[PDB]
């Protein structure tokens, strides 16, 4: 049911993939960015993608 | 707001909707454009 170990495993994996997408995009790694986006879309993750804010001092 | 930033914002929104809707080809197309432009992104699960 809700709050399962499996759901936490899959959420952890989806968060990893979102971080991998962010890094790949930032570094211009087009092949990895596409594979990360494919994976996220296959899983229909409720993802929010925004432009990173300028936060420097 | 330059034309490249406008497109980046469009691609981020399109990627968001594509992932939620399971649209793999659109997700691919948005991600490769963002990556080529090296757009700094903030990505998080809702």
Technique used by the depositors: X-ray
**Resolution of the PDB structure in angstroms:** 1.6
Q: How far is CA B5 from CA A5, A51, B45, in A?
A: 40, 9, 23
- Is B46 within a domain? no
Examine residue B23 and state whether it is found in any structural domain, yes or no: yes
Name the DSSP letter for residue A3: S
Domain of residue B28: give its range: 3-36
Is A34 among the domain residues? Answer: yes
Distance CA A50, CA B8 (A): 9
**What is the number of domains present in chain B?**
1
Instruction: Please answer yes or no on whether B43 and A18 come within 8 Å at the CB atom.
Output: yes
Q: Could you tell me which chain B residue has the CA closest to the CA of A24?
A: B35
Examine residue B24 and state whether it is found in any structural domain, yes or no: yes
Tell me, yes or no, whether B16 lies in a domain: yes
H or E element that contains B43? strand B41-45
Interface of B to A at Cβ within 8 Å reads: 5, 8-9, 12-13, 15-16, 18-24, 26-28, 30-32, 34-36, 38-46
Q: Examine residue A30 and state whether it is found in any structural domain, yes or no.
A: yes
CA angle B6, A53, A18 (to 5 degrees): 90
């Amino acid at each position: 049911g809700p709050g399962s170990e499996f759901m936490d495993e899959k959420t952890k994996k989806a968060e990893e993939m979102a971080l991998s997408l962010t890094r790949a995009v930032a570094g211009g790694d087009e092949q990895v960015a596409m594979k990360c986006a494919i994976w996220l879309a296959e899983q229909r993750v409720p993802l929010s993608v925004q432009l990173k804010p300028e936060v420097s001092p």
